[PDB]
Design a protein around this ligand. Structure first.
Ligand SMILES: CC(=O)N[C@H]1[C@H]([C@H](O)[C@H](O)CO)OC(C(=O)O)=C[C@@H]1O
Ligand SMILES: CC(=O)N[C@H]1[C@H]([C@H](O)[C@H](O)CO)OC(C(=O)O)=C[C@@H]1O
Ligand SMILES: CC(=O)N[C@H]1[C@H]([C@H](O)[C@H](O)CO)OC(C(=O)O)=C[C@@H]1O
Lengths: 521, 521, 521
């Protein structure tokens, strides 16, 4: 017979009880017993870090569904059902075998009775609790033995996959919140990691709703995270319900001249239970339009000021909706702080741009839009005094890229625009790492998004060595092949290590660490 | 100004901390203060049963959404979110006022500051723990005072609403199950109430999935219910996951000759995670087709036999799918036991019919379909030896009704067929009560169904006094105007009272008691 | 083996070279030859009217598609491809046999080699050129013989089907027009039939586009139709393209006092190539909003006046769009002429109503809407001075029905609103036939539409004998089971005969005559 094998390319959550490593499907109807499955973990693998390898049985397939060649009948582990994302759903899988503290060779003896039809199996990988974020797992499926015969394997995945670790900074249901979304991430001058996100208590739906801006803080490069803080929350302001007071879509930056940290977010007041994208209207006060609120921290992110309403400084009253671009912002070489922005103009078309402060965040200003019918953007200083804006474009298919040398007074279309970086119309993260700040001593531009033109899957980091003109395939790393909500934010953990917080297929707020030399060998 | 008022016509769950009694909408944009709201409970209302009356504020509405003239911005209390259906979502409502242990006149003093636009309020009713299923609440909204002025009330709901109690036998999330569906209900010869249903552990989706048949048993007329039992469950039969072993769509009956209780259900084995409606195929064994399984109890519902597979007795091998009609079956005067049935034939068309036993349930037989393109049905003995089958009809609009005098060898279209009983294509309950068995000393046919042609809402009981020829509007009672999953099943609690177990807007398995004299005055 | 049989319930176009009478599907994989098919035509059938009966082979089915149990692999005859709707597509069917001038017993000898799998056949009925609209064909499928053996027939269609003739007054492609839509039909005082419709030259899409109002006139009760006329056409008015000058959605009425015939239609000027539903705006002139235009004929419909612009007489300036309800209007008992209407108000919501004239059509007036969120409607005088408006309702599922005794100043909800009459949100025809004007000497209310809650198919005529309170199944007639565009319009051809012009599955403008006694026996 033939045995279809599909090895996964998904984050291994350290804290998870099960992680899908392999899917196995057997089509023979005359078979009776699965004797064993044999695996081998290479010596490059930190072998002492694997707690357990298990073999699960997933049953059979509906007869009219078998033509489609699905590798499982159902999702065995959920990354989205609140409170139960850390374990395999026991009603969907039957554990057939287990090797605890495996060596290089793993022999899962099951002698399990088979259905007269399709049979599904899968291999679960469970890491030890204190495992390092840099542990990489390589695994070879050596043999599938059915009815005494070792069968021929047909692989649907590439060879030499390296499985990477992740920590779920937030999971569905944590701290009473159904969902967490829209991540931002920075590293302070002291090396502290600060990740921000929407705390969406009632559901995953956008504003308007009961939404706070939360923050996780790590002092050890992301191995552990402190209890969630709430830098922005407005409760029952004005007497209205909490769900008519949400604040979200955070963007965070570190003022590198002083280590003051800033968070800007959009506060929606009223608007029933409708979406703010359609409910924010012209005007300037909270009863008409979303409010642009900013908080700061002068103690390395531990405590946060009371919100400051900066709406009047930057919003044209004719606009329907002004808000920041989610993710992060920057400090320019000359000390200017910059936040990406987006506004819906009087004709109900969104346009991306930037706001900037030359007085350490006390006053902010917006000059002109970068491009029509664009929304979420991130910005970088690609040369001293030259800003590059990388934009979600409603035309579809690819990121728009524009340049400004005058803080947004006039814009130029970049050569890479609407060609080089494909997207499914989604948030994308851009981060420039100057030669002086990384071990390769070369300017490296990093980009992260779902590497498709349709669908939020295959979350990928890409690197450019020519200031974003070309993105060579060999300088990219696939992080998550499965579907998720798609948003991500990059930061440098240290001079040689990238950190990423993103919405993944395994956890709402997923954190991973990647050696720069893994992207650029 | 004007103040829109809408009184609810929805079950008052005794165990709930909140129940929506009134919706209130104020349109004045220039107003400043809601001073008070005044309520009155008639002297007919047992006031000693009310724990508390509350005034809640629901905020305002999106400016572009005010066209649609709803009465609230969001659903304040959920009947479907697992684990949280018994209290109002505190993020959607702000409590303004509360009167504990009210008297006839209730003054809810709030002096609550209003939004410059639409303002939503609502009144919550909380009953005491020991409240009876027969308590009636009549409530009159006397005044809404804004800025010192009593405003003009415009009511969107009729006068003389009497609010009726209910008990949630099963609620979303109970005993670890996401949902409960498909109710059946009978009264044993000892007056014991037995209610059956799907226990749908993972979600509300139909077979195939992890589904058991559960049962709730009450010896006090439905005021209290014993711990859930599982008369049918197949676990990991054959080594397949539990989710590939569901059993559901139960039908229950009482052999009135002996008080033996019978439950029949459809067991689906394998089939992946697809719907049994498409995945059950021709054949006879479990690896091909759904199995028709039966359990019995001879101790008044307390314990249950192991399942009996009767598939081979009644199923034609060419049918794709044979199953019972959910709800209940009957004992005919001559002792014949009858269960409605439905099968998908080789043409992929479903057809309703009946199966019967002449030997107290030891063997069962099926003859011919009653009507093409029909599914779920319920049956009564409308005259001696004459069965009436009332059918969900895929043509749409109304119930089909057919008669058989030879246990399904030949069928006749009934005069009421496809004209009198409107439906949105959904399960409906039918129950016949002979003159000698009820306090009105009239033969009474009872029907329960969502009283619509589209949408599963306005669950209503209808009564016919001429053996189902006519359904006069004055002999109908609205129980639940809000949306739900729509199924229901009737029984006689006693000679004076109807019991109904149904899927409601407030609980997955909702029980209510209704005096025959409320229906027939 | 088994042979699945589906007899059709669709109009037989007299002018068609082929009409599908039976679908045949054989699932046997070991069979070799279809020897023959034997048909029987009753002696009620005027046999002299059948030109030919044919047996066609339609080939096989995709292997993954077979479980769906379709009765054909493809549509054998198109009602919609311009210029090719009158013959079977010969690339989809191979002719196996033919009986020209059949007698009562028809033997189609084929000895046709069968595919080793699913095999499709079908039987074609072709009528003689001069056949009458009243001819009825009753046909029995006597035997399907495969490999010498008469097979067991499994019917998907009811017994006692009577196949009815139809004439395609307009077919896709006729007179250079891609499409014809939106029928209206009346009978003048002289018995002349007048059918009006959109002539949609470029495609089937709604205004704006190159659209005229066309008219077919018959002096022999619909057996033959005069060359198409154009009562309304605007060409390059103002110098804009013909496609920025369309007029459509006609409504026609006979002033029975004088036999003057009126047609009202909506003329859209400019608006690029967008849909008038969104492009007509507030105002009154043609450069801003659709114009309500009227023409009259005083010579029994042979010639038509130049259009009169009556917009200023009844349009409120704040409305986005005012137009007639397509179909027909009435002449009330007191001489008032009445057209149903529909307007999109300043809040972008559509509402139905009526306009009327008390001076023989010289001046027109509108009072108040009947109901919110309603569009197309038809009106009758259900009793002297009492108008019944039957409305397409955007809430879905069923017609709204309202009553006015003061020509739209005030409205009352009819008992049947949103309960009695089913609907998929589509145009529907309503026509009242007074006792003295028909042969049953009873008031008869007639209704025609797609008899579904979803999908435009099963075009059906329904009759009510109690002024629209009840619509009994026995007084209904299915005309066309297959999908079409769904609009229809009724008239009385004479005191004994209904006429209907409608969009069918076989022709854009399909005309049929139906005896009143066939509806009400
Ligand atoms: C105001 C608001 O909520 N915006 C939402 C954003 C935006 O709507 C898109 O960029 C425009 O198309 O999209 C998403 C998303 O689910 O991807 C989340 C944001 O919360
Ligand atoms: C096997 C199965 O689950 N059937 C499902 C049933 C059926 O499909 C329909 O009656 C005909 O299509 O419908 C429903 C329903 O609430 O709508 C519930 C049943 O669980
Ligand atoms: C102005 C216009 O085009 N009206 C169109 C109508 C209308 O859009 C709907 O009644 C309200 O939405 O719909 C259709 C249709 O076959 O669906 C045809 C009419 O031409």
């Amino acid at each position: 017979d033939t045995v279809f094998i599909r090895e996964t390319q998904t984050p291994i959550l350290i804290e998870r009880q099960d992680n899908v490593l392999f899917y196995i499907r057997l089509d023979a109807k005359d078979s009776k017993l699965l004797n064993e499955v044999v695996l081998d973990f290479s010596k490059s693998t930190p072998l002492h870090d694997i707690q357990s390898v298990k073999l699960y049985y997933g049953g059979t397939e509906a007869l009219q569904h078998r033509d489609k060649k699905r590798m499982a009948p159902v999702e065995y582990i959920s990354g989205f059902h609140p409170g139960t994302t850390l374990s395999a759903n026991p009603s969907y899988s039957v554990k057939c075998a287990e090797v605890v503290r495996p060596s290089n060779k793993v022999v899962l003896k099951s002698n399990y009775k088979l259905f007269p039809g399709v049979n599904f199996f899968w291999i679960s990988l469970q890491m030890k609790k204190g495992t390092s974020l840099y542990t990489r797992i390589n695994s070879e499926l050596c043999a599938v033995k059915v009815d005494g015969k070792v069968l021929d394997c047909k692989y649907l995945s590439p060879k030499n996959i390296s499985h990477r670790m992740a920590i779920g900074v937030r999971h569905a249901g944590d701290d009473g919140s159904a969902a967490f979304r829209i991540p931002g991430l920075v590293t302070t001058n002291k090396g502290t990691l600060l990740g921000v996100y929407d705390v969406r208590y009632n559901s995953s739906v956008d504003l308007q709703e009961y939404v706070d801006v939360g923050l996780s803080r790590s002092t050890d490069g992301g191995e552990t995270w402190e209890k969630m803080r709430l830098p922005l929350s407005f409760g029952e302001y004005g007497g209205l319900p909490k769900a008519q007071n949400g604040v979200g879509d955070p963007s965070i930056l570190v003022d590198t001249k002083t280590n003051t940290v800033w968070i800007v977010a959009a506060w929606t007041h009223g608007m029933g239970n409708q979406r703010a994208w359609w409910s924010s209207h012209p005007g300037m006060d909270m009863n008409h339009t979303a409010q642009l609120m900013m908080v700061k921290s002068t103690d390395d992110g531990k405590t946060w000021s009371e919100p400051i309403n900066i709406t009047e400084q930057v919003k044209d009253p004719s606009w329907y909706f002004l808000l920041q671009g989610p993710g992060r912002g920057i400090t320019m070489s000359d000390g200017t702080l910059v936040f990406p922005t987006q506004f819906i103009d009087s004709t109900r078309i969104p346009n991306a741009g930037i706001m900037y402060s030359k007085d350490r965040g006390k006053t902010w200003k917006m000059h002109n839009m970068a491009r029509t019918n664009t929304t979420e953007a991130q910005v970088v200083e690609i040369e001293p005094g030259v800003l590059m804006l990388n934009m979600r474009d409603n035309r579809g298919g690819s990121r728009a890229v524009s340049i400004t040398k005058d803080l947004g007074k006039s814009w130029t279309e970049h050569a890479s625009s609407r060609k080089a970086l494909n997207e499914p119309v989604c948030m994308a993260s851009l981060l420039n790492v100057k030669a002086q700040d990384n071990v390769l001593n070369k300017d490296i531009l990093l980009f992260s998004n779902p590497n498709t033109v349709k669908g939020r899957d295959h979350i990928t980091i890409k690197a450019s060595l020519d200031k974003g003109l070309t993105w060579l395939p060999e300088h990219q790393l696939l992080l998550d092949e499965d579907p998720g909500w798609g948003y991500s934010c990059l930061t440098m953990i240290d001079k040689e290590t990238i950190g990423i917080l993103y919405e993944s297929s395994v956890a709402h707020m997923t954190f991973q660490a990647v050696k720069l030399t893994d992207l650029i060998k």
